[PDB]
Design a protein around this ligand. Structure first.
Ligand SMILES: [Cl-]
Length: 299
């Protein structure tokens, strides 16, 4: 079950741990699948978890940000307030400094003058180059997300989930899809590093007076995994920036195997149907689950 909050309960939660912090203004600033976010005093964003899974992502975000706060070339959220663990949440809330700016939507990017588009690609490449070069020696080993392990896990999850839903031959071809990707070593041979892992246009903030990127946000999915993940998340022509712009990022990053990035993107496009089934059933999102179930049913 998901949780809702009133403004009064948000204030009461903060006041229990921060009695000297006066709240003058509060409004909802956004809502995602994991947290509801509140703009408080017009200078802070407080995230409150909608469920236990979302609180684990929030706890991860807080811990990662504290490890990397002064290591990057763009502003990232700074943790200023933290809640506490309970039997229900790893972290009851967290409060971050607000970064002023708007998302660098594909529409906003493509209306920019070319010189500013090029600066945006360069700034993103430097951000990712520095992120992926952060020394990960100290980091907790459970942050490592091995992609081959993940694909094997999902295959077992899908069999468990769909054993009574799919007809025998349908499940056989699900098993075939998994077998084929697991035999292709290009997806699983990478050098692990710290990655953002949700590196998309909605998480890139832009200063429209300077026409420059002024922040990267929402680090709750960060992990030690394949650096190519942070390029393929920007490659979709519909919802993101497309291949031409991402190729500019790849050049400034000095990527040496662009064909492999493309092959990984192609497979992730196909793999989304299975992710929608998994996280559809997990979150209570039957919309997604039925959508993924119909997609794998036909193609
Ligand atoms: Cl921080």
């Amino acid at each position: 079950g998901m949780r809702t909050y009133t403004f009064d309960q948000v204030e009461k939660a903060i006041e229990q741990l921060y009695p000297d912090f006066t709240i003058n203004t509060i409004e909802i600033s956004g809502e995602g699948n994991d947290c509801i976010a509140y703009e408080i005093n017009r200078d802070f964003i407080f995230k409150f978890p909608k469920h236990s899974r979302g609180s684990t992502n929030l706890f991860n975000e807080v811990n990662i940000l504290k490890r990397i706060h002064n290591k990057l070339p763009l502003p990232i959220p700074e943790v200023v307030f933290t809640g506490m663990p309970s039997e229900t949440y790893q972290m009851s809330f967290a409060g971050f400094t607000k970064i002023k700016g708007v998302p660098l939507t594909p529409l906003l990017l493509n209306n920019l003058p070319k010189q500013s588009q090029n600066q945006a690609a360069k700034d993103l490449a430097r951000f990712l180059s520095e992120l992926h070069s952060i020394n990960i020696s100290g980091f907790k080993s459970n942050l490592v997300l091995d992609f081959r392990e993940k694909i094997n896990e999902d295959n077992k999850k899908i069999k468990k989930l769909l054993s009574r839903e799919l007809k025998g031959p349908q499940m056989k071809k699900v098993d075939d899809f998994y077998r084929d990707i697991l035999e292709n070593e290009i997806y699983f041979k990478y050098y692990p590093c710290l990655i953002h892992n949700d590196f998309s246009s909605d998480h890139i903030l832009f200063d429209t007076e300077k026409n420059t990127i002024c922040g990267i946000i929402d680090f709750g999915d960060a992990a030690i995994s394949d650096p190519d993940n942070d390029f393929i998340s920007l490659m979709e022509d519909d919802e993101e920036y497309g291949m031409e712009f991402v190729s500019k990022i790849l050049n400034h990053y000095k990527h040496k195997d662009i064909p492999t990035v493309l092959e990984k993107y192609r497979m992730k496009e196909k793999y989304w149907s299975f992710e929608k089934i998994i996280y559809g059933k997990e979150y209570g999102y039957m919309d997604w689950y039925e959508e993924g179930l119909n997609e794998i049913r036909s193609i």
